[PDB]
Design an enzyme around this catalytic site. Structure first.
Site, PDB file in Angstrom:
ATOM      1  N   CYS A  59       1.929   5.243  11.315  1.00 40.11           N
ATOM      2  CA  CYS A  59       3.621   5.329  11.317  1.00 40.11           C
ATOM      3  C   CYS A  59       4.186   3.876  11.098  1.00 40.11           C
ATOM      4  CB  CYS A  59       3.354   6.316  12.703  1.00 40.11           C
ATOM      5  SG  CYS A  59       2.889   4.810  14.213  1.00 40.11           S
ATOM      6  N   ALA A  62       2.744   1.535  14.382  1.00 39.22           N
ATOM      7  CA  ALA A  62       1.823   1.145  13.549  1.00 39.22           C
ATOM      8  C   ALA A  62       2.262  -0.470  12.594  1.00 39.22           C
ATOM      9  CB  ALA A  62       0.864   2.097  12.704  1.00 39.22           C
ATOM     10  N   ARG A  93      -6.508  -4.378  15.358  1.00 38.36           N
ATOM     11  CA  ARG A  93      -6.940  -5.247  14.785  1.00 38.36           C
ATOM     12  C   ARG A  93      -6.926  -6.657  14.860  1.00 38.36           C
ATOM     13  NH1 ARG A  93      -1.360  -7.534  12.507  1.00 38.36           N
ATOM     14  NH2 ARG A  93      -1.685  -7.131   9.809  1.00 38.36           N
ATOM     15  N   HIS A 192       7.613  -1.824   9.012  1.00 35.56           N
ATOM     16  CA  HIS A 192       6.825  -3.537   8.388  1.00 35.56           C
ATOM     17  C   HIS A 192       8.450  -3.461   8.476  1.00 35.56           C
ATOM     18  CE1 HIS A 192       3.318  -2.252   6.066  1.00 35.56           C
ATOM     19  NE2 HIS A 192       2.797  -2.951   7.475  1.00 35.56           N
TER      20      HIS A 192
END
Ligand code: ICS
Ligand code: CLF
Ligand code: CLF
Ligand SMILES: [Fe+3]
Lengths: 477, 522, 522, 477
Positions: A59, A62, A93, A192
């Protein structure tokens, strides 16, 4: 195999889909041709996932919280909404950092507003303000707060920008609201973009009127390296041995002050184009800082990138670059001499998110290894434009591949090795194909630079030539 | 720099002098880091009583929670059924996270689909998403059943699962006879175990609500077993083994042990084992239904007592000695089958282990956390072992559960120094283990950071972690362990006593300093 | 001084200031201790190559052996039979030591008698001791059988066990039909496993040598299983479970698993389970005999092949993956029963575990020791896991066994850095782990001191110990574990990978120093 | 129970024995009468064990190597003979010490000649000499070597005294030969005696002509305390707080120099009379050093012993003794106030080796506990003379009890707690009776002194009142 065989395989894989899903997915699969410069006439990407087809994509939360904002260590990131999204992304991560986790760095912690029914019905703005007060009370050494919105925040009409502005003015602290709700966009790519916009609008323009930072002619920033297992540090050591000064790291092991000092550098070194091209273009437009893409996967790409970076500076930097290359030549040459015989001629299939499916091809080819299939979760068509030339002829290209599609492709192609994420790892391990996690490096790494190349070659040898892959069939069957 | 014969990964590659110098340059030049004295002072403050008071005055901030959201439990429950695809109506990011979480805990493939609701569905709803997703999933993965839960986006929007599934069947996207049970699993209510409860109740009602006329209680001579949210395969296996040993006919409804333990033989099986639809349909014909984890199966209990008319026994989780005894006696009473000599012998062997190890287990202080039934079973077993569970934390516990645990603690002299916390997260527990230091911690992998914090204060303040619960990410194959029954009690006892002995060995390994107590025989 | 609410045992009571001062006064005033600089210098010397050369030039001195004496194995084998009293002819101190050793390893009662030969028997022999002991033992403990081994005193004196037992029967001390098998078990020959072999051969010949006329091979449709010296109850249980799963009739001769795992229920059972005398008598009627640990069952193999006329298969210990596969295929071929789907599924699950953990297991260097068959099975499994068994020590191994292990190592690329040592003790192994440091040690509790020594050189030189083998004294209930079959391979794999991960977690727990690699997910 | 009932129970227990064994064992069982001063008319001890009856006794090697010589830390002790005896006694006894185990202390190591068939047939004197050479080479900081003979050494005609003398003269090192072969004697008692004689003949007389040690009027030695879990240290702290100087400790945490310095002390404080009375009498005869028995088990015995010891010195020592008693009164009073209510009225049955069956009775009685049965493995009749007054009326006395006898006595008497060794521990734990190891303190302790009393009371409470003892019967039976 031949190109016609690949098209035939694509068609018979697509046969089982319903008409709409098959028609959609036919646009997302391609046979490579390195002579083609525009992928829009070869493949379609950055589109909706077909419902109920087991996509690998994540998503926007994320892509924003987990990818861009979370690595920044001195900031506290609040997963605003129900407990789940923050709980599943906590320390998942491997964006490595140096700090004291309860005190001045907070990367692996989970801060969340933990929405309940009352917060859903009546909103959570007052809860957000009280949460920010409690964060200030209990973690005084935080240098900033980001609020990463989860899905319900974008649906219940919560105004986190007003709360952020009011509380940031009151506490004289940077509070960055990020509308990174999961339903926005189609994958982590829009996350992003939203995170880059938040950086531009709330953090980047903090020291424009400040001129107390001394700038050398060799000032560079690393943009889009998230220090997975220490990749950013392995790149930075080579960059500084070249005579360059790395002012900022985005965002692995990154601090808010480094982000605020980035507008003062002379060059931007963008590793992940996909996740940080927006901020790189904004910095080039507003501050006039040139940016260039570089690859530190494998010795050939590392040497090419180092020479290209040193060509942007004076002759002393070029001399130091040649010195670094000569110093590291024996190390990677020994790594090749040891591991290439064990890996030569072996075929690889890759499916990673947005940069690595094309960035790690040179590291594979440096060990005698060929990549016969590659694909992306959330890449755009510029990523495929860059990918087509890096791929061989008649190699498979897949965008937003489904679980069934990837399994069928692996069954027909039969690669020696598969590099993908954790959701495909055990699927392909059960099918008897050696698997390497290409997101977390299988909890190994780094893979950048020459030290990273040594680690990467050792890992590929340890997995591909593992004895366990010759024991899957019982001797009585 | 790397030696080709001694290649170093991140640890200890970054401990090298050049990397240390580069990191120090980065810290001193651009990070604007706080002085180390300030950082040490703030850490020392975070270990104090004043910080604990401020931490426990929290009302809006949650730090390091010890729970997940409902659709995770719904996905697990759906995986417990035969050739069943878990299907989450809503956003695909949730499904990616659920799959990754379960992949890391079980180290096995986890199948789950999403209909990928996006902003276009934010105002229009996800009806078309549901239709296309059901059709595509059935065509592609060929499940016998699709079990539908929801993400928080679909719950907030207000999607009607029943109407959407009915419209999908009405317009031919999926056959009208195809089983599509559903459950609303809002991530803002309860936790993952609540999602397991909701999904199971949805499936049970889907298969039995409209077929109760021809149902007679106790006509198949079986006992229904509802395990609840369970992440130890050994627990399913031990329940099945103990019931087969007694010669008791049973139906384990939502059994995912097969699909979470698929062999590696050159072929990937998306489906394996699981509760069949015939078992779910015949479930009302059982003698009774036993809920292994009652404190998160309340909706299932209400449905089973109200519709199946099963007099569900008041049974605790079969954890430890006494509660396993009560479970076996209740099973014997319901089924008419006596407890065999093998189970009595196993109980005697567990009691022998307790007598063998009671000296090293007595008086040990534990801080523990996890799900309500698991936590209270662990507390009961610790009280049976003579241990002291001083800090009992359950983030997803409630007031009635806290009252039950307080009653359990008050019945034993070893629960006198114990406090139960509900709605508290792992930052609260970190304050508690700093302020009233226990000997050990029991919980999932998220506790490891707490241990690190304690070790930062000093080796004498370090609280070692014992990994029992969900999720365990930093150890391999611990999901194969058992916590239920005498077998689970033996495994837990072995783990506890050997953690104590390993800690003692580490503390007494110093030559000429503490090695006078480095006994060969313990 | 003690606080009544915080009473301290020896650790850390003697770390208190007054105790430290008193100890320092004792050391400085009267101990005439060497200077600490001298002690440090000598220790550093003991960790060196020169010290290793001097250590490996040893011919007459043994330091910290990794073996025991024959009558211990004879006692274990005798305990493997039904209502059988182990009876050691000789000195009572040996029996006290055997009982204490087994009590500490198994944490359970161990029954064994001695005839208490003293100096009065040093020249006169122990005939009267044998008569009185047989009579008293039969009258008091009412065994169905008395299995006689010897202490070194009786072996040196030259006591004739056969003549002594015959004279005891001839003069009415015990009934002539009472079974009294015997075996000479000289402690100066071989080791404890040799004693197990000798005792088993004595019992088998006692029950079958004079009754072979009516014996037909394969007439009972069973396979004999001789386990050898075994101290893991899980190994007996796994062999029985795997044979029952295949539907293969078997006789496990010398099965002590029941008497070593007696339940605690208010009653002490001196005897429980065990191989019946009918099983021993009918053993020649089996299809074949399989020896689980061939390298210390050579006398038993000679008797079984020469008298029972059983074509004993050439099988390694069923340890690891390949050797378990070979054992199962041989059992299938002998019995005609196919390998069921459950065993294939278990093998696939072990292979899945190996694929899951190969990344953390690859290239790890191990020093290991133990009995020959166990050691070579462990070496084979480590080679299957991609590990490197650099230091392979077997104090009671021989040249043929060393050649076999060298052949095993040469067949795998992971055995290229491995060296096999026979006749070497744990001081040799301490030198080896100081000089060519492995990542881990695998062996019994006596290795813990080696770890302490390594930690004394520095944390970076510490070699952690993994307790697999016999005896384990400092951990509880490890004797219940399994090392045979796929189940034992899974347990060993879990232990190895989790020891690696626990060591990595300990190494990366330093805040702001190494905690950048303190990954939640591994 | 009544005395007549105890005699009846003894007679029923003896019924299953054969005539000779029953006639022998009738002399080893008694009903206590505290008014009797001579036990030879009440009980018989220090005799042969009846064959094949599961005696608990050990060998002379256990009494010499494992008890007296092994604790001495700076000496290397060679178990001469086959590997077994040394292997089974390695680190099995918790005689605590301070030192560096590979370098200057060697208590928990196993040194053995590891006899083979060739050594049995042709002797092991040359092997012993070569072994001593190798010990000198590889452990240069050892301050002496003892050679503890195992059984075959006494039967193959090996002369270890000549080898010891020759090699000790050659290397200028103390080499003590001990003919402690297991077949000698009837139990560990003869091992004690042989080890005491070896100490007298080879170590004790080393500094008779040496007068460079300054002697104070308050010089005492501790004899017969083996520092089990730190018992000797807990006694020594109280002795030194009294103003006394403890020159030597025999032999727990003991060094060879302390043994050599013992003939210079003013008082010998003998804890274990059984194992060290020989050397105490020899020192009194040769050097004129008085010796006295003391008990440091429990506060009452500790206070009585401290006053008795201080009465042997001047008034300043008596004042310091009263100060120590007053200082420690609150601690043991608090221990009693906490643990006596949980232990009052509970009955104990003991079977330990040669000192503790009578020495720990006062510690039990200080917690409201009564001892209804006691016995010894290897005590002499003087030990029973001391035991009869410490026992109550109509209490059971057993010498060299057999396994069957002890189970029968426990079944009839039904004590609340049993204190014995490891070979009875799990037998009686299976029968549902709480068990405390009275040799190793169940890997706990110390039990001497006031700190030891605290530990002992806590241990008795933790085992006697453990919940596990109320769960032995299944609820369905
Ligand atoms: S030496 Fe003796 S058997 Fe006096 S051989 Fe034995 S460490 Fe016992 S009753 Mo084990 S005469 Fe010491 C003894 Fe007592 S080993 Fe210890 S506890 S006080
Ligand atoms: S697409 Fe992304 S991860 Fe999904 S919710 Fe949305 S921001 Fe979050 Fe969150 S609590 Fe659980 S995991 Fe969801 S159902 Fe909601
Ligand atoms: S009574 Fe004592 S312990 Fe016994 S032998 Fe004799 S000195 Fe020794 Fe030794 S090697 Fe084994 S344990 Fe014996 S049979 Fe010989
Ligand atoms: Fe797996």
């Amino acid at each position: 195999m031949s190109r016609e065989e690949v098209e035939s395989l694509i068609q018979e894989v697509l046969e089982v889909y319903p008409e709409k899903a098959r028609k959609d997915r036919n646009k997302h699969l391609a046979v490579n041709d390195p002579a083609v410069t525009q992928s829009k006439k070869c493949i379609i990407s950055n589109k909706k996932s077909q419902p109920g087809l087991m996509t690998i994509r994540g998503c926007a939360y994320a892509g924003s919280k987990g990818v861009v904002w979370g690595p920044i260590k001195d900031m506290i990131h609040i997963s605003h909404g129900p407990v789940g999204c923050g709980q599943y992304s906590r320390a998942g991560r491997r964006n490595y950092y140096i700090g004291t986790t309860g005190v001045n760095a907070f990367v692996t912690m989970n801060f969340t507003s933990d929405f309940q029914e009352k917060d859903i019905v009546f909103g959570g703005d007052k809860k957000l303000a009280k949460l920010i007060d409690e964060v200030e009370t209990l973690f005084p050494l935080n240098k900033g707060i980001s609020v990463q919105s989860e899905c319900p925040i974008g649906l219940i009409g919560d105004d986190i920008e007003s709360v952020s502005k009011v509380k940031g003015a009151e506490l004289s602290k940077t509070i960055v609201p990020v509308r990174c709700e999961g339903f926005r966009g189609v994958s982590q790519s829009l996350g992003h973009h939203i995170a880059n916009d938040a950086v531009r609008d709330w953090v980047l323009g903090k020291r424009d009127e400040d001129t107390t930072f001394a700038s050398t002619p060799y000032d560079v920033a690393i943009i889009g390296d998230y220090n997975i297992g220490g990749d950013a540090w392995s790149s930075r050591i080579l960059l500084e041995e070249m005579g360059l000064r790395c002012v900022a790291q985005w965002s692995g092991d990154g601090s808010i002050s480094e982000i605020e000092l980035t507008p003062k550098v002379k060059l931007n070194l963008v590793h992940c184009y996909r996740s940080m091209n927006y901020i790189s273009r904004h910095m080039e437009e507003k501050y006039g800082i040139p940016w260039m893409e570089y690859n530190f996967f494998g010795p050939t790409k590392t040497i090419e990138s180092l020479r290209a970076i040193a060509a942007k500076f004076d002759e002393s930097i070029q001399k130091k670059c040649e010195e670094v290359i000569a110093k590291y030549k024996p190390e990677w040459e020994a790594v090749v001499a040891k591991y290439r015989p064990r890996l030569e001629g072996k075929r690889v299939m890759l499916y990673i998110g947005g940069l690595r499916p094309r960035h790690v091809i040179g590291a594979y080819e440096d060990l005698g290894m060929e990549v016969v299939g590659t694909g992306y979760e959330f890449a755009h068509n510029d990523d495929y434009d860059r990918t087509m030339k890096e791929m061989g002829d008649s190699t498979l290209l897949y965008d937003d591949v489904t679980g069934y599609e990837f399994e069928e492709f692996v069954k027909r192609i039969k690669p020696d090795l598969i590099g993908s994420g954790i959701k495909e790892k055990f699927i392909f391990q059960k099918m008897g194909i050696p698997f390497r996690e290409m997101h977390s490096w299988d909890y190994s790494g780094p893979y950048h630079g020459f030290d990273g190349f040594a680690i990467f070659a050792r890992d590929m040898d340890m997995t591909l030539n593992n004895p366990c892959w010759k024991k899957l069939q019982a001797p009585w069957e | 720099s790397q030696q080709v014969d001694k290649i170093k990964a991140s640890y200890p590659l970054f401990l090298d002098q050049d990397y240390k110098d580069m990191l120090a340059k980065k810290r001193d030049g651009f990070e604007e880091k706080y002085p180390q004295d300030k950082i040490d002072e703030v850490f020392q403050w975070t270990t104090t009583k004043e910080y604990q008071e401020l931490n426990f005055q929290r009302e809006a901030l949650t730090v390091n929670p010890a729970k997940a959201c409902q659709p995770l439990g719904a996905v697990l429950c759906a995986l417990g059924f035969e050739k069943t695809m878990p299907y989450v109506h809503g956003s695909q990011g949730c499904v990616a996270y659920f799959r990754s979480y379960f992949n890391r805990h079980f180290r096995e493939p986890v199948s789950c689909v999403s209909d990928s609701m996006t902003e276009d569905a934010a105002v229009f709803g996800g009806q078309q998403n549901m239709k296309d997703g059901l059709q595509n999933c059935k065509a592609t993965y060929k499940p016998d059943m699709i079990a539908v839960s929801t993400t928080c986006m679909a719950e907030v929007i207000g999607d009607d699962l029943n109407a959407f599934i009915n419209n999908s069947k009405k317009e031919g996207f999926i056959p009208d006879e195809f089983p599509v049970p559903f459950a609303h699993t809002p991530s803002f209510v309860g936790s993952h175990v609540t999602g397991w409860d909701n999904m199971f109740e949805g499936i049970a009602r889907y298969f039995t609500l409209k077929s109760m006329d021809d149902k007679v209680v106790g006509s198949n001579k079986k006992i229904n077993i509802v395990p609840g949210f369970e992440t130890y395969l050994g627990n399913f296996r031990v329940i099945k083994r103990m019931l087969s040993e007694m010669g008791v006919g049973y139906s384990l409804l939502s059994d995912p042990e097969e699909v979470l333990d698929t062999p590696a033989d050159g072929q990937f099986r998306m489906y394996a084992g699981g509760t069949t639809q015939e078992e779910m349909k015949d479930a009302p014909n059982a003698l009774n239904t036993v809920l292994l984890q009652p404190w998160h199966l309340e909706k299932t209990k209400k449905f089973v007592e109200g519709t199946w008319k099963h007099e569900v026994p008041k049974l605790n989780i079969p954890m430890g000695l006494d509660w396993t005894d009560e479970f076996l006696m209740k099973v014997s009473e319901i089924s008419g089958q006596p407890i065999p000599a093998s189970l009595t012998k196993e109980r005697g062997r567990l009691v022998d282990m307790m007598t063998d190890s009671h000296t090293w287990l007595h008086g040990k202080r534990f801080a523990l956390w996890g799900d309500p039934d698991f936590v209270m079973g662990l507390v009961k077993f610790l009280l049976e072992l003579g241990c002291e569970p001083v800090h009992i934390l359950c983030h997803n516990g409630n007031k009635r559960w806290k009252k039950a645990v307080d009653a359990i603690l008050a019945a034993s002299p070893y629960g006198k120094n114990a406090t139960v916390y509900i709605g508290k997260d792992l930052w609260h527990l970190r304050s508690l283990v700093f302020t009233d230091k226990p000997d050990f911690m029991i919980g999932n992998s998220y506790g490891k950071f707490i241990q690190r914090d304690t070790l930062h204060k000093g080796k004498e303040f370090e609280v070692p972690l014992i990994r029992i619960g969900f999720p365990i990410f930093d150890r391999h194959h611990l999901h194969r362990s058992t916590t239920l029954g005498y077998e689970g009690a033996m495994q837990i006892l072995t783990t506890l006593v050997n953690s104590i002995l390993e800690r003692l060995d580490e503390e007494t390994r110093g030559m000429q300093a503490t090695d006078y107590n480095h006994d060969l025989v313990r």
